[PDB]
Amino acid sequence: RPQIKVGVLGATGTVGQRFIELLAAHPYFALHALGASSRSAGQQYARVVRWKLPSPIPDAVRHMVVHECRPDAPGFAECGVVFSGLDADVAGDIENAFRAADLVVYSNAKNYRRDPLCPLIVPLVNPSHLSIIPYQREQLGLKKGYIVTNANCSTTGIVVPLAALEKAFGPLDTVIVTTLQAISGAGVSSLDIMDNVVPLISGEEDKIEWETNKILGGVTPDNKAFDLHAPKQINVSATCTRVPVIDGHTGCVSVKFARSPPPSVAEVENAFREYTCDAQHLGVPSAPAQAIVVHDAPDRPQPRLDKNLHNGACVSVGRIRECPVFDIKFVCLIDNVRLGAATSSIINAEIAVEKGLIQ
Amino acid sequence: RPQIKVGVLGATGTVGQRFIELLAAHPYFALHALGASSRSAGQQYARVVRWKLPSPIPDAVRHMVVHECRPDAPGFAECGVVFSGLDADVAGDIENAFRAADLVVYSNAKNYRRDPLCPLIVPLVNPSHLSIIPYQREQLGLKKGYIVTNANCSTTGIVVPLAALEKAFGPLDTVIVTTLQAISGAGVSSLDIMDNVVPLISGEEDKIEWETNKILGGVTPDNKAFDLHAPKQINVSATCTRVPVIDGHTGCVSVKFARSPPPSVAEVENAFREYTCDAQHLGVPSAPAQAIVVHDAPDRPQPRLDKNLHNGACVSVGRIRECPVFDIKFVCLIDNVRLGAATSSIINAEIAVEKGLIQ
Amino acid sequence: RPQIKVGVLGATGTVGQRFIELLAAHPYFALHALGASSRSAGQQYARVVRWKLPSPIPDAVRHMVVHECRPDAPGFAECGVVFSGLDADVAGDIENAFRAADLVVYSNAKNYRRDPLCPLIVPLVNPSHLSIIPYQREQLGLKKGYIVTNANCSTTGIVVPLAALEKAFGPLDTVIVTTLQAISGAGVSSLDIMDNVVPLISGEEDKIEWETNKILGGVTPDNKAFDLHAPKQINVSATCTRVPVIDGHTGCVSVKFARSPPPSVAEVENAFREYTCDAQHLGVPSAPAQAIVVHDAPDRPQPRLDKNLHNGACVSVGRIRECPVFDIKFVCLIDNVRLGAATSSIINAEIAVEKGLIQ
Amino acid sequence: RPQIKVGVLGATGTVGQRFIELLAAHPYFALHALGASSRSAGQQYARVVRWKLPSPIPDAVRHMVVHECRPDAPGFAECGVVFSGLDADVAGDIENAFRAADLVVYSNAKNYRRDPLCPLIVPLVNPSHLSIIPYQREQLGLKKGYIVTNANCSTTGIVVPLAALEKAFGPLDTVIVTTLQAISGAGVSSLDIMDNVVPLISGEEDKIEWETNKILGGVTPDNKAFDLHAPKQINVSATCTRVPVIDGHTGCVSVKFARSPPPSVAEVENAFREYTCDAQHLGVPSAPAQAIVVHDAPDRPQPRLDKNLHNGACVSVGRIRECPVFDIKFVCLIDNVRLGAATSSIINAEIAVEKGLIQ
């Protein structure tokens, strides 16, 4: 009910735009400080942005002035959380500067994802990893500031179903995944992709392979480290492709469980339907009512058909069936528009509010 | 070398059109009898066909008259081989009628693929399976007639690389594959597929999973049966998807070898480059000079870029690399236009000519 | 306001399905009689239809039974209006039979469009042409029955802007138009259209060229004939193409006015913004609040961006500028999903209800 | 037969890459000097270029060193012709510097297209305009150097058919054209164009409208000026759109002839079939055997089907028919891959070699 002033870095970029759209409509986060390039600084948001979203620029921000991306620019020192939609080329130094100036940063860049003090949180899976924040502060000589990184959409679309499986049936041994990723990802030139498939997305396989164990793992009982799902880490092998689709990342997944016997198809269907997470239990405003939708039709999910599901649902799965090689295989879909980078970072921040990590 | 009169069933259909294009240009097979529907019978090919191919209708056939699809229609009794581009709904009874009338049938339908006397041949892999034909004849009380089925393009695009691996490194234990299949497959409505992915192609996974062991297996020493790669059958798990691409089936493949230690990346690259098969050794006219092309670029092959390769090459592979879970993973591509159903069936027939199974 | 029982012919077809969806949600038209093939007759809608629409089959109809397409089949004699989504191959005799049995028919087939007693109505342009209906009845010895034909989507996307021009600036002399039509039209196979343009849509140019003068013309003062915009008919030349787009028909239009001097760009923009039509004035339930949207951006409208406009708006225009050859040129767009055949026919019927042509 | 050393400016850009591909394969033009940015100068082509073409970088150039874009950089003073694939932002000063240093420049920038001494040549239409070159030299105090500009692909696809009409039936009065332009030749992001139409291509209409008269016009009998098709200039009005198609620019054209009566459809078909131009008569190596293909099928040409035509043909037309408004309308297609900027510039140069304007 009392407002919390927030910042958006990279405000003119597409992620920044979405942050702005969602935060204007938010029940307690209040847009207070926008950061963009040196070329845009000093201009009003409305005049410098190339607004690429269906609905129009909100009134609250039309006449807000974009500033340089530093912690001592106008408004930023009063922000209780600063959201970052910056590209990795510039995000590292800047996000570090905001944190060094004792501000709280929710990032979407790669720069801090593997940092051993910085949580990498998929909000529908591992918000508990906020427990390491005090130790991050202490180690930097900070009282208030820290960094949390949000995961990318293809990783999210995979680990959410995996988390539901681990919660219901215990740890996973082995995971194989092939992705078919839409172009909203980011960009991709039409020449590269039309009437084609590009079987490489650089860095993407390695992200899924490494990050899955961080995200599905825990924090050590002392709250000073990530266990990365040790001692027995999940074996993950990915192949990531790009397809000529605007929105919707599809994943084809095979799973082997550590425990025997493996569940039946029906038990796996139920595990997905029933899955509920901390963020829903805390009742944060941006959490969906339904975490995973199970499709019964044999040819679903499909990215173009199964966007904007009911109950705010953002991940879905289908074609759940036996795998002659492992235990179970299936197809999953993430609506990377609804559960994009901005939405994930916001839900993460809402949870930090509930835990008293933000004022 | 002396001409061999041939038939084409389903001549007005797309597969039939291709058969006609290729056979008109062929050094010894001579188009002699065309079969189409009861609605087209008696008319000249040129007036009934909706010719959907880039180049024009050949001269040899413009004024040929299409007949009913039975073995006693005009011309068929004199054909040394009858090629079938029929859909499965009608192909079973008709192909059986032709064989029963002591004619030789090279089919692309599913009906006879699992028949225990009928070889299922990918011409660049297992033409040796022709050894069971005398037994097939004997069992049907036939002196001349028999059925051979050609495999589909997605199966072919996968098993050709697999065969090269088996020839070089011995039998395979486990294979996981995700396909991204173009629409030339067949049809698919633009509404179903534009800006989308359809993660089911009915029957396709089951075909790849079963047929792989028949094709990569052998014939028993008595030449009366297929061993289906028993006792140690390959474990295959597939997910097959459709993508909005006109031509080119892409496969993402992970492989575990039966033998230890597994080969290095460089050894696998060589196994692919060097692979040569019976059809090339026999020098049949339609066989390619190069069976598999290895792409060195980290983002290749791509269906739109890597069609119409040099040396008549039809299958390529790329992104050959270690798999954290199995031994090796890679991406493969089949040019389903160049190595389509018609081309495969023809090459099969050329080989049967070299072995004296056709006059 | 009191309910009016309605029929749908071609109910299992895609247009029929849309009629059903819309009429189930309608404030007074009540689905009463469904017609489909002789093969489906006697079965329940839910069991015979291949429902191809995003949302599910409505409750009101799940258990309704389909009948033969004749006026004396069950339910039809009590219908106050019968909607036809039949294809032209069968629609003529059937629609005539319904009319001959003194029923009211709103057709989407070509068969009656040029009939000199049957109005061809674009509901946002020429519902006044209902004035000829008493004469149509009198000439057929009918007290209640008649036929009105609805125009198609590409014609509608062009004539709506033309009408706004005529209302504001008087009659048009000359019109040249190229269309870029989406595939929702209906379907088109992916093979025909992906990565391509098909520069023929059979019958489509001829319809635009002839129908425009009927639709933008008047009814003679005696209410017995259409003047077809005589003596000074509009000269229209069209080329109609299909493009690989799911929804949205785009038109590139050049116009010469009869009157001199021609209006300025700004005057034309206002004419479009301000345009309001009989259907809005009557407040029929299915009419939009805004008839034409004007886009100010130099690169708009675009079919993918400008669907589902605010205020129920269905037609938009942009790039309004001088034509070095004629007077004014522009780009228009019709959302053929929102303002499709079924919607147009229904709006037409709502207007006839307001004028007392239906009980 | 003796080699002619050539330069390429903008060698790392996409047009530059194509120039390089084609000139490596050319029977007498020999790649001698490459120009790129100050940042790339001194490095080898292979190490600085982001090579975006299907086939690999040729051997001849892998180890060639790029230099600054000035006439006194290494190699340039010995080039007999310098090809420019530079963007207009920089091209003006640079191309002028090369010419001022007495070198010959074939440009694809806009800068010199309207210059009253510089021919704007579509090689299949107006190479006669080389007659003004001596006057261009004289006016600049130059003995050897000059500039010629090549026209773009969409202009070319239109004016070639127009030229055939003028040669056969005399001058044109009026032309209206809507283009549907593929994404090849520029770039376009997949987000802008997938499942969409972009009805603006900036500068493109203006070019077609102005350039058509220059190109179809003549040079004055004194060889000092372009008549720009005066005294009676062609009235041209264009709308240019972008569609989601990789290759092939399609044009929908209506034409009014100055002379009466206008030709019949059959006469127009023959005019197109029979058209042959100076470049073919001279037998330059890169000219096609057939200048325009006429398609008889009612639904042709189509960009995806009618690329790589026989006889090296690059422009085709179809749907030739009466226009109710003007005289004749039709659909045209240019294969902008085969007949792109680089190819057009090269053919132009080949013609200048035959006329002795190059050593």
Dist CA B32 CA B76 (whole Å): 8
- Tell me which H or E stretch contains B278: helix B278-281
Instruction: Reduce the DSSP state of residue B260 to 3 states and report it.
Output: coil
- Tell me which H or E stretch contains C9: strand C4-9
Residue B179 token pair: 């396909």
C296-306 residues labelled b (16+ CB within 10 A) or e (exposed):
eeebbbbbbbb
**CATH superfamily ID and name for D153-335:** Dihydrodipicolinate Reductase; domain 2 (3.30.360.10)
β-strand pairing of A4-9 with A81-84: parallel
Q: Give the residue before each break in chain B, using a C-to-N cut-off of over 2.5 angstroms; say none if it is continuous.
A: 186
Dist CA B234 CA B158 (whole Å): 13
Residue B342 token pair: 């018609």
Dist CA D306 CA D296 (whole Å): 13
Q: Quick check: A329 contacting B, CB < 8 Å?
A: yes
Dist CA A259 CA A166 (whole Å): 10
Dist CA D244 CA A293 (whole Å): 33
Q: Please report, to the nearest 10 degrees, the dihedral formed by the alpha carbons of residues A264, A267, A271, A273 taken in order.
A: 120
Dist CA A146 CA A128 (whole Å): 16
Which chain C residues in 129-188 lie under 8 Å from chain B, judged by CB atoms? 183-184, 187-188
How far does D207 lie from chain C, in Å, by closest CA?
Answer: 13
Instruction: Reduce the DSSP state of residue A1 to 3 states and report it.
Output: coil
CA separation (Å) from D102 to A183, D72, D225? 48, 11, 21
Residue located via tokens 């909607």: C83
A56 DSSP 8-state letter: P
Please report, in angstroms and rounded to a whole number, the separation of the first and last CA atoms in chain B.
Answer: 10
Instruction: Reduce the DSSP state of residue C107 to 3 states and report it.
Output: strand
C121 DSSP β-pair partners? C150
Q: Quick check: C296 contacting A, CB < 8 Å?
A: no
Residue D215's region, left for phi above 0, alpha for psi from -120 to 50, else beta, is: alpha
Residue spans of alpha helices (H) in chain C? 14-24, 45-48, 59-62, 88-100, 133-140, 153-169, 190-193, 204-216, 265-274, 278-281, 341-354
- Tell me which H or E stretch contains B178: strand B172-181
CATH 3.40.50.720 positions along chain C are 1-152+336-359
The one-letter code for the residue type at D328 is I
Radius of gyration of chain A (CA): 20
Say which residues have a Cβ less than 8 Å from residue B122's Cβ, sequence separation at least 6.
B150, B151, B155, B156, B159, B160, B163, B215, B344
Query: Is A15 assigned a ligand-binding role in the annotation?
Result: yes
Please count the other Cβ atoms lying within 10 Å of the Cβ belonging to residue B174: 19
Dist CA B319 CA B321 (whole Å): 6
CA separation (Å) from D245 to B73, C46, D197, D305? 45, 40, 10, 12
Q: Which H, E and C letters describe C29-48, residue by residue? A: EEEEEEECCCCCCCCEHHHH
Q: Are C337 and C247 in contact (CB under 8 A)?
A: yes
B209·A324 Cβ contact <8 A: yes
CB-nearest partner of D197 from C174, C180, C235 = C180
Listing from the earlier edge strand, what are the strands of the sheet with D29-35?
D66-67, D29-35, D4-9, D81-84, D104-107, D146-150, D120-121
Residue C26, Cα to own-chain centre: how many angstroms?
18
Instruction: Tell me: cis bond preceding A285? Omega within 30 of 0 counts.
Output: no
Residue D246 token pair: 């990789």
Residue C265 token pair: 């760009």
CATH 3.30.360.10 positions along chain C are 153-335
Q: Are D228 and D214 in contact (CB under 8 A)?
A: yes
Residue A136 token pair: 């991050």
- Tell me which H or E stretch contains C332: strand C328-334
C192·B193 Cβ contact <8 A: no
Residue located via tokens 């400008």: C306
- Residues of chain B with Cβ-Cβ distance to D308 below 8 Å are 54
- What method did the depositors use to determine the structure? X-ray
Please count the other Cβ atoms lying within 10 Å of the Cβ belonging to residue A47: 11
Dist CA C234 CA D203 (whole Å): 31
Q: Are D320 and D3 in contact (CB under 8 A)?
A: no
The one-letter code for the residue type at A324 is P
Instruction: Tell me: cis bond preceding D231? Omega within 30 of 0 counts.
Output: yes
Nearest residue to A105 (alpha-carbon basis) of A74, A65, A137? A137
**Which of A26, A32, A249, A295 is an active site residue?**
A249
Dist CA C146 CA A72 (whole Å): 76
CB-nearest partner of C325 from D174, D241, D324 = D174
Q: Are A254 and A325 in contact (CB under 8 A)?
A: yes
Resolution in Å, one decimal, please: 2.6
Query: For residue D195, what is the nearest residue in chain B, using CA coordinates?
Result: B195
Instruction: Tell me: cis bond preceding C231? Omega within 30 of 0 counts.
Output: yes
- Residues of chain C with Cβ-Cβ distance to B201 below 8 Å are none
Instruction: Reduce the DSSP state of residue B34 to 3 states and report it.
Output: strand
Q: Quick check: D191 contacting C, CB < 8 Å?
A: no
Instruction: Tell me: cis bond preceding D298? Omega within 30 of 0 counts.
Output: no
Dist CA B325 CA B123 (whole Å): 32
Dist CA C301 CA C295 (whole Å): 6
A240 DSSP β-pair partners? A179
Dist CA D111 CA D91 (whole Å): 7
- Residues of chain C with Cβ-Cβ distance to D323 below 8 Å are 237
Q: Are A80 and A58 in contact (CB under 8 A)?
A: no
Nearest residue to A166 (alpha-carbon basis) of A272, A11, A35, A288? A272
Please count the other Cβ atoms lying within 10 Å of the Cβ belonging to residue D295: 21
A226 DSSP 8-state letter: B
Residue B126 token pair: 């297992």
Residue D155: Cβ-neighbour burial (10 angstroms; 0-12, 13-18, 19+): buried
A236·B324 Cβ contact <8 A: yes
Q: At what angle do helices A153-169 and A265-274 cross, to 10 degrees?
A: 110
β-strand pairing of C66-67 with C29-35: parallel
- Tell me which H or E stretch contains B59: helix B59-62
Instruction: Reduce the DSSP state of residue A297 to 3 states and report it.
Output: coil
Please count the other Cβ atoms lying within 10 Å of the Cβ belonging to residue A39: 9
The one-letter code for the residue type at B213 is N
Dist CA D20 CA D56 (whole Å): 11
Dist CA D303 CA D318 (whole Å): 12
Residue A153 a catalytic site member:
yes
**CB–CB contacts below 8 A, A to B:** 123
Strands (E), B23-145: 29-35, 81-84, 104-107, 120-121
CA separation (Å) from C2 to B27, C60, C89, C359? 78, 18, 35, 9
CA separation (Å) from D316 to B292, D274, D292, D335, D336? 37, 13, 5, 9, 12
C179-197 residues labelled b (16+ CB within 10 A) or e (exposed):
bbbbbbbeebbbbbbbbbb
Dist CA A129 CA A214 (whole Å): 10
State the sign of the Cα–Cα–Cα–Cα dihedral D58, D60, D63, D66.
negative
Please report, in angstroms and rounded to a whole number, the separation of the first and last CA atoms in chain D.
Answer: 11
Q: Are B291 and B124 in contact (CB under 8 A)?
A: yes
Dist CA C192 CA D90 (whole Å): 42
Q: Are A277 and A121 in contact (CB under 8 A)?
A: no
Instruction: Reduce the DSSP state of residue B156 to 3 states and report it.
Output: helix
Q: Are B95 and B84 in contact (CB under 8 A)?
A: yes
A57 DSSP 8-state letter: P
How far does D335 lie from chain B, in Å, by closest CA?
Answer: 15
- Residues of chain A with Cβ-Cβ distance to D188 below 8 Å are 189-191
Instruction: Tell me: cis bond preceding A301? Omega within 30 of 0 counts.
Output: yes
Query: Is C296 assigned a ligand-binding role in the annotation?
Result: no
Residue D285, Cα to own-chain centre: how many angstroms?
16
Query: For residue D242, what is the nearest residue in chain A, using CA coordinates?
Result: A190
Query: For residue D194, what is the nearest residue in chain C, using CA coordinates?
Result: C245
Q: Which H, E and C letters describe chain D, residue by residue? A: CCCEEEEEECCCCHHHHHHHHHHHCCCCEEEEEEECCCCCCCCEHHHHCCCCCCCCCCHHHHCCEEECCCCCCCCHHHCCEEEECCCHHHHHHHHHHHHHCCCEEEECCCCCCCCCCCCEECCCCCHHHHHHHHHHHHHHCCCCCEEEEECCHHHHHHHHHHHHHHHHHCCEEEEEEEEEECCCCCCCEHHHHCCCCECCCCCHHHHHHHHHHHHHCCECCCCCCECCCCCCCCEEEEEEEECCCCCCEEEEEEEEECCCCCCCHHHHHHHHHHCCCHHHHCCCCCCCCCCEEECCCCCCCCCCCCCCCHHHCCEEEEEEEECCCCCEEEEEEECCCCCCHHHHHHHHHHHHHHCCCCC
Write phi, then psi, for D144 (nearest 5 degrees): -120, -40
Nearest residue to B127 (alpha-carbon basis) of B279, B275, B281? B279
Dist CA D192 CA D171 (whole Å): 39
D197·C252 Cβ contact <8 A: no
Write phi, then psi, for A172 (nearest 5 degrees): -90, 145
B305·D54 Cβ contact <8 A: yes
β-strand pairing of D292-294 with C4-9: unpaired
Residue B203 token pair: 């029957």
**CB–CB contacts below 8 A, A to D:** 45
Largest CA distance in chain C: 64
Class (C level, CATH) for A1-152+336-359: alpha beta
Instruction: Reduce the DSSP state of residue B128 to 3 states and report it.
Output: helix
Residue D241: Cβ-neighbour burial (10 angstroms; 0-12, 13-18, 19+): buried
A128-150 residues labelled b (16+ CB within 10 A) or e (exposed):
ebbbbbebbbeebebeebbbbbb
B294 DSSP β-pair partners? B317
Write phi, then psi, for C221 (nearest 5 degrees): -55, -30
Q: Are C341 and C150 in contact (CB under 8 A)?
A: yes
Say which residues have a Cβ less than 8 Å from residue C39's Cβ, sequence separation at least 6.
none
State the sign of the Cα–Cα–Cα–Cα dihedral C193, C197, C200, C202.
positive
A176 DSSP 8-state letter: E
Q: Are B12 and B39 in contact (CB under 8 A)?
A: no
- Residues of chain C with Cβ-Cβ distance to D326 below 8 Å are 237
